[PDB]
């Protein structure tokens, strides 16, 4: 029932585009001529028309066809890129109402507001179809799971670095993890690639250890710079505070109880050393 004025969604012919649907305005009544709704477009300059197989064309799904579907973990959804919709799976619903959506090429995880999402639907050429809810991995290092990545500072120090696990892949029989640094402030121009990292470099987030007291000399881990670094409790200070010094030696600054971690390690189970 497409008409000349109809907004329309056109499928991606190209690689790395498998899961997109672009916004367009059809210029024809039944290849077909479409003008793409693009960002940074002033209507002042004459639009550009591309010709598409009706094969790669579908109508915009009407709201009533998908307004009944609830957004939960495993729900296939589309994210509004304004000029287009990008399809992925919801892997976390946060209590604040935000969502974490996964994409598989390149593998990435993005946080969205509810308004930026719609449930995904498929056009048969005849009618709309609801996709199945997707089973989710909740393994130890499932996607979205927060872990720590080993790093070396300068010559020899072993520092641990918080990162989200995007995907676990195998490369030539070697377990690898694609990981994301969730602590960087990115600009709009900045919004960027995840790094692939050997399995040996990745460990779980250390479970919490309450201590309630620390004693001088203790090996301890404090988050300095933006990595966890090893240190020794030089001083015990008024009320709950400590003077910590890192194993490379520079100076000692005050630290609070909260910011200290029992220095722990993971080799099979989790143990000191």
PDB file of C-alpha atoms in Angstrom:
ATOM      1  CA  UNK A   1       0.000   0.000   0.000  1.00  0.00           C
ATOM      2  CA  UNK A   2       3.001   2.233  -0.416  1.00  0.00           C
ATOM      3  CA  UNK A   3       2.224   5.670  -1.813  1.00  0.00           C
ATOM      4  CA  UNK A   4       4.287   8.469  -3.322  1.00  0.00           C
ATOM      5  CA  UNK A   5       4.467  10.470  -0.109  1.00  0.00           C
ATOM      6  CA  UNK A   6       5.026   7.469   2.189  1.00  0.00           C
ATOM      7  CA  UNK A   7       7.963   7.400   4.536  1.00  0.00           C
ATOM      8  CA  UNK A   8       9.656   4.091   3.956  1.00  0.00           C
ATOM      9  CA  UNK A   9      12.467   1.965   5.384  1.00  0.00           C
ATOM     10  CA  UNK A  10      15.147   0.554   3.089  1.00  0.00           C
ATOM     11  CA  UNK A  11      17.327  -2.428   3.833  1.00  0.00           C
ATOM     12  CA  UNK A  12      21.090  -2.464   3.731  1.00  0.00           C
ATOM     13  CA  UNK A  13      22.764  -3.908   0.707  1.00  0.00           C
ATOM     14  CA  UNK A  14      26.286  -3.585   2.094  1.00  0.00           C
ATOM     15  CA  UNK A  15      28.624  -5.291   4.587  1.00  0.00           C
ATOM     16  CA  UNK A  16      28.597  -4.051   8.168  1.00  0.00           C
ATOM     17  CA  UNK A  17      25.091  -2.875   7.426  1.00  0.00           C
ATOM     18  CA  UNK A  18      23.290  -6.201   7.883  1.00  0.00           C
ATOM     19  CA  UNK A  19      21.168  -4.891  10.742  1.00  0.00           C
ATOM     20  CA  UNK A  20      20.140  -1.409   9.660  1.00  0.00           C
ATOM     21  CA  UNK A  21      16.973   0.063   8.129  1.00  0.00           C
ATOM     22  CA  UNK A  22      17.378   3.554   6.695  1.00  0.00           C
ATOM     23  CA  UNK A  23      14.717   6.269   6.705  1.00  0.00           C
ATOM     24  CA  UNK A  24      13.611   7.294   3.245  1.00  0.00           C
ATOM     25  CA  UNK A  25      10.916   9.081   1.286  1.00  0.00           C
ATOM     26  CA  UNK A  26       9.647   7.087  -1.641  1.00  0.00           C
ATOM     27  CA  UNK A  27       9.436   9.041  -4.865  1.00  0.00           C
ATOM     28  CA  UNK A  28       7.359   6.433  -6.702  1.00  0.00           C
ATOM     29  CA  UNK A  29       4.224   4.414  -7.219  1.00  0.00           C
ATOM     30  CA  UNK A  30       4.786   0.799  -8.373  1.00  0.00           C
ATOM     31  CA  UNK A  31      13.744  -0.515  -9.075  1.00  0.00           C
ATOM     32  CA  UNK A  32      12.161   2.389  -7.190  1.00  0.00           C
ATOM     33  CA  UNK A  33      13.320   5.933  -6.443  1.00  0.00           C
ATOM     34  CA  UNK A  34      13.930   6.994  -2.842  1.00  0.00           C
ATOM     35  CA  UNK A  35      15.346  10.089  -1.184  1.00  0.00           C
ATOM     36  CA  UNK A  36      17.229   9.300   2.062  1.00  0.00           C
ATOM     37  CA  UNK A  37      16.397  11.231   5.221  1.00  0.00           C
ATOM     38  CA  UNK A  38      19.903  12.131   6.298  1.00  0.00           C
ATOM     39  CA  UNK A  39      21.333  14.234   9.089  1.00  0.00           C
ATOM     40  CA  UNK A  40      23.104  17.501   8.390  1.00  0.00           C
ATOM     41  CA  UNK A  41      20.841  17.963   5.371  1.00  0.00           C
ATOM     42  CA  UNK A  42      19.534  21.416   4.532  1.00  0.00           C
ATOM     43  CA  UNK A  43      16.494  21.048   2.259  1.00  0.00           C
ATOM     44  CA  UNK A  44      17.875  24.027   0.314  1.00  0.00           C
ATOM     45  CA  UNK A  45      20.084  21.887  -1.939  1.00  0.00           C
ATOM     46  CA  UNK A  46      18.303  19.522  -4.347  1.00  0.00           C
ATOM     47  CA  UNK A  47      17.939  16.051  -2.773  1.00  0.00           C
ATOM     48  CA  UNK A  48      19.716  12.958  -4.055  1.00  0.00           C
ATOM     49  CA  UNK A  49      17.708   9.987  -5.288  1.00  0.00           C
ATOM     50  CA  UNK A  50      18.852   6.386  -5.109  1.00  0.00           C
ATOM     51  CA  UNK A  51      17.230   3.420  -6.872  1.00  0.00           C
ATOM     52  CA  UNK A  52      16.397   0.297  -4.873  1.00  0.00           C
ATOM     53  CA  UNK A  53      14.997  -3.150  -5.577  1.00  0.00           C
ATOM     54  CA  UNK A  54      11.538  -3.284  -3.946  1.00  0.00           C
ATOM     55  CA  UNK A  55      13.152  -6.335  -2.410  1.00  0.00           C
ATOM     56  CA  UNK A  56      15.092  -4.111   0.006  1.00  0.00           C
ATOM     57  CA  UNK A  57      12.102  -1.889   0.746  1.00  0.00           C
ATOM     58  CA  UNK A  58       9.477  -2.028   3.490  1.00  0.00           C
ATOM     59  CA  UNK A  59       6.946   0.235   5.082  1.00  0.00           C
ATOM     60  CA  UNK A  60       7.335   1.822   8.458  1.00  0.00           C
ATOM     61  CA  UNK A  61       5.843  -0.543  11.003  1.00  0.00           C
ATOM     62  CA  UNK A  62       2.666   0.906  12.504  1.00  0.00           C
ATOM     63  CA  UNK A  63       2.845   1.506  16.254  1.00  0.00           C
ATOM     64  CA  UNK A  64      -0.100  -0.750  17.058  1.00  0.00           C
ATOM     65  CA  UNK A  65       1.762  -3.682  15.513  1.00  0.00           C
ATOM     66  CA  UNK A  66       4.499  -3.426  18.142  1.00  0.00           C
ATOM     67  CA  UNK A  67       3.168  -1.297  21.015  1.00  0.00           C
ATOM     68  CA  UNK A  68       2.025  -4.445  22.827  1.00  0.00           C
ATOM     69  CA  UNK A  69       5.462  -6.059  22.922  1.00  0.00           C
ATOM     70  CA  UNK A  70       7.303  -5.512  26.175  1.00  0.00           C
ATOM     71  CA  UNK A  71      11.006  -4.628  26.299  1.00  0.00           C
ATOM     72  CA  UNK A  72      12.869  -7.243  28.352  1.00  0.00           C
ATOM     73  CA  UNK A  73      16.155  -9.132  28.263  1.00  0.00           C
ATOM     74  CA  UNK A  74      16.323 -11.086  25.020  1.00  0.00           C
ATOM     75  CA  UNK A  75      14.042  -8.681  23.201  1.00  0.00           C
ATOM     76  CA  UNK A  76      15.140  -7.827  19.655  1.00  0.00           C
ATOM     77  CA  UNK A  77      14.914  -4.051  19.253  1.00  0.00           C
ATOM     78  CA  UNK A  78      15.750  -1.206  16.881  1.00  0.00           C
ATOM     79  CA  UNK A  79      17.551   1.910  17.998  1.00  0.00           C
ATOM     80  CA  UNK A  80      16.734   5.262  16.550  1.00  0.00           C
ATOM     81  CA  UNK A  81      19.688   6.757  14.782  1.00  0.00           C
ATOM     82  CA  UNK A  82      17.440   9.430  13.401  1.00  0.00           C
ATOM     83  CA  UNK A  83      18.520   8.709   9.905  1.00  0.00           C
ATOM     84  CA  UNK A  84      18.100   5.034  10.515  1.00  0.00           C
ATOM     85  CA  UNK A  85      17.258   2.183  12.807  1.00  0.00           C
ATOM     86  CA  UNK A  86      19.877  -0.265  14.040  1.00  0.00           C
ATOM     87  CA  UNK A  87      18.794  -3.681  15.203  1.00  0.00           C
ATOM     88  CA  UNK A  88      20.170  -5.529  18.225  1.00  0.00           C
ATOM     89  CA  UNK A  89      19.227  -7.405  21.411  1.00  0.00           C
ATOM     90  CA  UNK A  90      18.416  -6.034  24.847  1.00  0.00           C
ATOM     91  CA  UNK A  91      20.850  -7.621  27.271  1.00  0.00           C
ATOM     92  CA  UNK A  92      20.155  -5.532  30.350  1.00  0.00           C
ATOM     93  CA  UNK A  93      17.262  -3.535  31.686  1.00  0.00           C
ATOM     94  CA  UNK A  94      18.472  -1.115  34.326  1.00  0.00           C
ATOM     95  CA  UNK A  95      16.219  -0.079  37.219  1.00  0.00           C
ATOM     96  CA  UNK A  96      16.607   3.571  36.250  1.00  0.00           C
ATOM     97  CA  UNK A  97      14.756   2.634  33.058  1.00  0.00           C
ATOM     98  CA  UNK A  98      17.712   2.688  30.691  1.00  0.00           C
ATOM     99  CA  UNK A  99      18.621  -0.331  28.523  1.00  0.00           C
ATOM    100  CA  UNK A 100      21.779  -2.111  27.380  1.00  0.00           C
ATOM    101  CA  UNK A 101      21.577  -3.299  23.788  1.00  0.00           C
ATOM    102  CA  UNK A 102      24.053  -5.581  22.056  1.00  0.00           C
ATOM    103  CA  UNK A 103      25.299  -5.448  18.457  1.00  0.00           C
ATOM    104  CA  UNK A 104      27.305  -8.193  16.773  1.00  0.00           C
ATOM    105  CA  UNK A 105      29.196  -6.363  14.000  1.00  0.00           C
ATOM    106  CA  UNK A 106      31.288  -4.892  15.255  1.00  0.00           C
ATOM    107  CA  UNK A 107      30.392  -6.440  18.622  1.00  0.00           C
ATOM    108  CA  UNK A 108      29.450  -3.600  20.925  1.00  0.00           C
ATOM    109  CA  UNK A 109      27.127  -2.729  23.794  1.00  0.00           C
ATOM    110  CA  UNK A 110      25.280   0.583  23.997  1.00  0.00           C
ATOM    111  CA  UNK A 111      23.114   2.191  26.624  1.00  0.00           C
ATOM    112  CA  UNK A 112      19.798   3.671  25.450  1.00  0.00           C
ATOM    113  CA  UNK A 113      16.797   5.558  26.821  1.00  0.00           C
ATOM    114  CA  UNK A 114      13.385   3.965  26.354  1.00  0.00           C
ATOM    115  CA  UNK A 115      12.350   6.550  23.775  1.00  0.00           C
ATOM    116  CA  UNK A 116      15.251   5.566  21.461  1.00  0.00           C
ATOM    117  CA  UNK A 117      14.009   1.982  21.183  1.00  0.00           C
ATOM    118  CA  UNK A 118      11.245   0.166  19.372  1.00  0.00           C
ATOM    119  CA  UNK A 119      10.688  -3.568  19.309  1.00  0.00           C
ATOM    120  CA  UNK A 120      11.957  -5.143  16.107  1.00  0.00           C
ATOM    121  CA  UNK A 121       9.543  -6.515  13.525  1.00  0.00           C
ATOM    122  CA  UNK A 122       9.989  -8.344  10.241  1.00  0.00           C
ATOM    123  CA  UNK A 123       8.136  -7.488   7.029  1.00  0.00           C
ATOM    124  CA  UNK A 124       7.146 -10.636   5.122  1.00  0.00           C
ATOM    125  CA  UNK A 125       6.113  -8.686   2.053  1.00  0.00           C
ATOM    126  CA  UNK A 126       2.578  -9.192   3.294  1.00  0.00           C
ATOM    127  CA  UNK A 127       2.440  -8.625   7.044  1.00  0.00           C
ATOM    128  CA  UNK A 128       4.388  -7.910  10.219  1.00  0.00           C
ATOM    129  CA  UNK A 129       6.011 -10.629  12.272  1.00  0.00           C
ATOM    130  CA  UNK A 130       7.214 -10.567  15.876  1.00  0.00           C
ATOM    131  CA  UNK A 131      10.646 -12.156  16.277  1.00  0.00           C
ATOM    132  CA  UNK A 132      11.213 -14.662  19.098  1.00  0.00           C
ATOM    133  CA  UNK A 133      12.572 -13.498  22.450  1.00  0.00           C
ATOM    134  CA  UNK A 134      16.255 -14.429  22.494  1.00  0.00           C
ATOM    135  CA  UNK A 135      17.873 -16.748  25.062  1.00  0.00           C
ATOM    136  CA  UNK A 136      20.680 -14.964  26.889  1.00  0.00           C
ATOM    137  CA  UNK A 137      24.029 -16.189  28.144  1.00  0.00           C
ATOM    138  CA  UNK A 138      24.468 -15.526  31.847  1.00  0.00           C
ATOM    139  CA  UNK A 139      27.855 -17.215  32.065  1.00  0.00           C
ATOM    140  CA  UNK A 140      30.640 -15.877  34.269  1.00  0.00           C
ATOM    141  CA  UNK A 141      31.895 -13.711  31.425  1.00  0.00           C
ATOM    142  CA  UNK A 142      28.629 -13.164  29.528  1.00  0.00           C
ATOM    143  CA  UNK A 143      28.241  -9.977  27.491  1.00  0.00           C
ATOM    144  CA  UNK A 144      27.779  -6.940  29.682  1.00  0.00           C
ATOM    145  CA  UNK A 145      29.493  -8.638  32.589  1.00  0.00           C
ATOM    146  CA  UNK A 146      31.976  -6.329  34.265  1.00  0.00           C
ATOM    147  CA  UNK A 147      35.499  -7.757  34.609  1.00  0.00           C
ATOM    148  CA  UNK A 148      39.105  -6.671  35.174  1.00  0.00           C
ATOM    149  CA  UNK A 149      41.893  -6.612  32.590  1.00  0.00           C
ATOM    150  CA  UNK A 150      45.571  -6.881  33.453  1.00  0.00           C
ATOM    151  CA  UNK A 151      47.908  -4.099  32.424  1.00  0.00           C
ATOM    152  CA  UNK A 152      51.540  -3.339  32.912  1.00  0.00           C
ATOM    153  CA  UNK A 153      52.513   0.091  34.009  1.00  0.00           C
ATOM    154  CA  UNK A 154      55.819   1.080  32.557  1.00  0.00           C
ATOM    155  CA  UNK A 155      58.325  -1.707  33.091  1.00  0.00           C
ATOM    156  CA  UNK A 156      56.858  -4.217  35.515  1.00  0.00           C
ATOM    157  CA  UNK A 157      53.851  -3.266  37.639  1.00  0.00           C
ATOM    158  CA  UNK A 158      50.709  -5.312  37.428  1.00  0.00           C
ATOM    159  CA  UNK A 159      47.684  -3.081  37.487  1.00  0.00           C
ATOM    160  CA  UNK A 160      44.097  -4.162  37.089  1.00  0.00           C
ATOM    161  CA  UNK A 161      41.763  -2.248  34.863  1.00  0.00           C
ATOM    162  CA  UNK A 162      37.943  -2.296  34.970  1.00  0.00           C
ATOM    163  CA  UNK A 163      36.252  -3.101  31.652  1.00  0.00           C
ATOM    164  CA  UNK A 164      32.973  -4.502  30.342  1.00  0.00           C
ATOM    165  CA  UNK A 165      33.019  -7.762  28.472  1.00  0.00           C
ATOM    166  CA  UNK A 166      31.493  -7.365  25.029  1.00  0.00           C
ATOM    167  CA  UNK A 167      32.054 -10.795  23.482  1.00  0.00           C
ATOM    168  CA  UNK A 168      34.130 -13.902  23.918  1.00  0.00           C
ATOM    169  CA  UNK A 169      35.645 -15.142  20.674  1.00  0.00           C
ATOM    170  CA  UNK A 170      38.004 -17.862  19.616  1.00  0.00           C
ATOM    171  CA  UNK A 171      40.943 -16.976  17.388  1.00  0.00           C
ATOM    172  CA  UNK A 172      42.929 -20.002  16.224  1.00  0.00           C
ATOM    173  CA  UNK A 173      41.946 -22.009  19.266  1.00  0.00           C
ATOM    174  CA  UNK A 174      42.865 -19.222  21.670  1.00  0.00           C
ATOM    175  CA  UNK A 175      40.172 -17.739  23.886  1.00  0.00           C
ATOM    176  CA  UNK A 176      39.935 -13.981  23.386  1.00  0.00           C
ATOM    177  CA  UNK A 177      37.697 -11.291  24.878  1.00  0.00           C
ATOM    178  CA  UNK A 178      36.441  -8.136  23.224  1.00  0.00           C
ATOM    179  CA  UNK A 179      36.302  -5.547  25.996  1.00  0.00           C
ATOM    180  CA  UNK A 180      35.166  -1.952  26.465  1.00  0.00           C
ATOM    181  CA  UNK A 181      36.492   0.777  28.714  1.00  0.00           C
ATOM    182  CA  UNK A 182      33.334   2.245  30.265  1.00  0.00           C
ATOM    183  CA  UNK A 183      35.131   5.009  32.125  1.00  0.00           C
ATOM    184  CA  UNK A 184      36.238   7.235  29.247  1.00  0.00           C
ATOM    185  CA  UNK A 185      34.440  10.483  28.625  1.00  0.00           C
ATOM    186  CA  UNK A 186      33.707  10.616  24.914  1.00  0.00           C
ATOM    187  CA  UNK A 187      32.680  13.655  22.870  1.00  0.00           C
ATOM    188  CA  UNK A 188      30.101  13.581  20.109  1.00  0.00           C
ATOM    189  CA  UNK A 189      32.872  13.363  17.564  1.00  0.00           C
ATOM    190  CA  UNK A 190      34.573  10.832  19.783  1.00  0.00           C
ATOM    191  CA  UNK A 191      31.649   8.431  20.043  1.00  0.00           C
ATOM    192  CA  UNK A 192      36.042   4.438  18.954  1.00  0.00           C
ATOM    193  CA  UNK A 193      36.792   0.759  19.002  1.00  0.00           C
ATOM    194  CA  UNK A 194      36.757  -2.040  21.511  1.00  0.00           C
ATOM    195  CA  UNK A 195      39.937  -3.993  22.073  1.00  0.00           C
ATOM    196  CA  UNK A 196      40.435  -7.725  21.654  1.00  0.00           C
ATOM    197  CA  UNK A 197      42.446  -9.156  24.531  1.00  0.00           C
ATOM    198  CA  UNK A 198      43.878 -12.599  25.420  1.00  0.00           C
ATOM    199  CA  UNK A 199      41.927 -14.707  27.924  1.00  0.00           C
ATOM    200  CA  UNK A 200      44.898 -14.779  30.297  1.00  0.00           C
ATOM    201  CA  UNK A 201      44.541 -11.027  30.861  1.00  0.00           C
ATOM    202  CA  UNK A 202      40.965 -11.220  32.126  1.00  0.00           C
ATOM    203  CA  UNK A 203      39.650 -12.005  35.584  1.00  0.00           C
ATOM    204  CA  UNK A 204      36.316 -11.563  37.396  1.00  0.00           C
ATOM    205  CA  UNK A 205      35.491  -8.463  39.399  1.00  0.00           C
ATOM    206  CA  UNK A 206      36.782  -9.264  42.874  1.00  0.00           C
ATOM    207  CA  UNK A 207      33.918 -10.003  45.269  1.00  0.00           C
ATOM    208  CA  UNK A 208      33.609  -7.482  48.090  1.00  0.00           C
ATOM    209  CA  UNK A 209      35.596  -8.040  51.210  1.00  0.00           C
ATOM    210  CA  UNK A 210      34.452  -6.118  54.230  1.00  0.00           C
ATOM    211  CA  UNK A 211      37.395  -5.509  56.463  1.00  0.00           C
ATOM    212  CA  UNK A 212      36.406  -2.741  58.873  1.00  0.00           C
ATOM    213  CA  UNK A 213      40.021  -2.439  59.938  1.00  0.00           C
ATOM    214  CA  UNK A 214      43.293  -2.488  58.079  1.00  0.00           C
ATOM    215  CA  UNK A 215      46.650  -2.881  59.713  1.00  0.00           C
ATOM    216  CA  UNK A 216      49.804  -1.151  58.685  1.00  0.00           C
ATOM    217  CA  UNK A 217      51.959  -2.932  56.149  1.00  0.00           C
ATOM    218  CA  UNK A 218      49.065  -4.764  54.554  1.00  0.00           C
ATOM    219  CA  UNK A 219      49.226  -5.399  50.867  1.00  0.00           C
ATOM    220  CA  UNK A 220      46.259  -3.572  49.499  1.00  0.00           C
ATOM    221  CA  UNK A 221      44.810  -2.384  46.227  1.00  0.00           C
ATOM    222  CA  UNK A 222      43.810   1.188  45.623  1.00  0.00           C
ATOM    223  CA  UNK A 223      42.231   2.679  42.529  1.00  0.00           C
ATOM    224  CA  UNK A 224      44.772   5.256  41.374  1.00  0.00           C
ATOM    225  CA  UNK A 225      44.839   7.005  38.035  1.00  0.00           C
ATOM    226  CA  UNK A 226      42.123   4.898  36.441  1.00  0.00           C
ATOM    227  CA  UNK A 227      43.589   1.504  37.349  1.00  0.00           C
ATOM    228  CA  UNK A 228      43.759  -0.647  40.471  1.00  0.00           C
ATOM    229  CA  UNK A 229      47.338  -0.661  41.765  1.00  0.00           C
ATOM    230  CA  UNK A 230      49.055  -2.604  44.472  1.00  0.00           C
ATOM    231  CA  UNK A 231      50.243  -0.761  47.583  1.00  0.00           C
ATOM    232  CA  UNK A 232      51.131  -1.000  51.243  1.00  0.00           C
ATOM    233  CA  UNK A 233      49.323   0.534  54.224  1.00  0.00           C
ATOM    234  CA  UNK A 234      51.976   2.826  55.657  1.00  0.00           C
ATOM    235  CA  UNK A 235      49.777   4.617  58.175  1.00  0.00           C
ATOM    236  CA  UNK A 236      46.602   4.250  60.161  1.00  0.00           C
ATOM    237  CA  UNK A 237      44.920   7.576  60.524  1.00  0.00           C
ATOM    238  CA  UNK A 238      42.326   9.439  62.406  1.00  0.00           C
ATOM    239  CA  UNK A 239      39.057   7.646  62.427  1.00  0.00           C
ATOM    240  CA  UNK A 240      38.844   5.653  59.258  1.00  0.00           C
ATOM    241  CA  UNK A 241      41.605   6.663  56.925  1.00  0.00           C
ATOM    242  CA  UNK A 242      44.901   5.320  55.681  1.00  0.00           C
ATOM    243  CA  UNK A 243      48.155   6.455  54.222  1.00  0.00           C
ATOM    244  CA  UNK A 244      48.809   4.163  51.341  1.00  0.00           C
ATOM    245  CA  UNK A 245      51.893   3.827  49.262  1.00  0.00           C
ATOM    246  CA  UNK A 246      52.239   1.963  46.008  1.00  0.00           C
ATOM    247  CA  UNK A 247      54.958  -0.580  45.385  1.00  0.00           C
ATOM    248  CA  UNK A 248      56.656   1.656  42.928  1.00  0.00           C
ATOM    249  CA  UNK A 249      57.560   4.451  45.307  1.00  0.00           C
ATOM    250  CA  UNK A 250      56.721   8.083  44.939  1.00  0.00           C
ATOM    251  CA  UNK A 251      54.682   9.492  47.726  1.00  0.00           C
ATOM    252  CA  UNK A 252      51.929   8.542  49.980  1.00  0.00           C
ATOM    253  CA  UNK A 253      48.552  10.153  49.925  1.00  0.00           C
ATOM    254  CA  UNK A 254      45.569   9.823  52.109  1.00  0.00           C
ATOM    255  CA  UNK A 255      42.965   7.312  51.165  1.00  0.00           C
ATOM    256  CA  UNK A 256      39.662   6.415  52.733  1.00  0.00           C
ATOM    257  CA  UNK A 257      38.482   3.077  53.905  1.00  0.00           C
ATOM    258  CA  UNK A 258      36.028   2.691  51.048  1.00  0.00           C
ATOM    259  CA  UNK A 259      38.687   3.093  48.439  1.00  0.00           C
ATOM    260  CA  UNK A 260      40.834   0.279  49.734  1.00  0.00           C
ATOM    261  CA  UNK A 261      40.598  -3.296  48.519  1.00  0.00           C
ATOM    262  CA  UNK A 262      42.110  -6.404  50.077  1.00  0.00           C
ATOM    263  CA  UNK A 263      44.799  -7.239  47.526  1.00  0.00           C
ATOM    264  CA  UNK A 264      43.503 -10.479  46.034  1.00  0.00           C
ATOM    265  CA  UNK A 265      44.254 -12.680  43.068  1.00  0.00           C
ATOM    266  CA  UNK A 266      42.487 -15.111  40.767  1.00  0.00           C
ATOM    267  CA  UNK A 267      44.256 -18.194  39.472  1.00  0.00           C
ATOM    268  CA  UNK A 268      41.555 -20.767  39.956  1.00  0.00           C
ATOM    269  CA  UNK A 269      39.681 -19.656  43.028  1.00  0.00           C
ATOM    270  CA  UNK A 270      40.543 -16.224  44.343  1.00  0.00           C
ATOM    271  CA  UNK A 271      43.462 -15.921  46.734  1.00  0.00           C
ATOM    272  CA  UNK A 272      46.056 -13.485  48.095  1.00  0.00           C
ATOM    273  CA  UNK A 273      49.595 -12.917  46.722  1.00  0.00           C
TER     274      UNK A 273
END
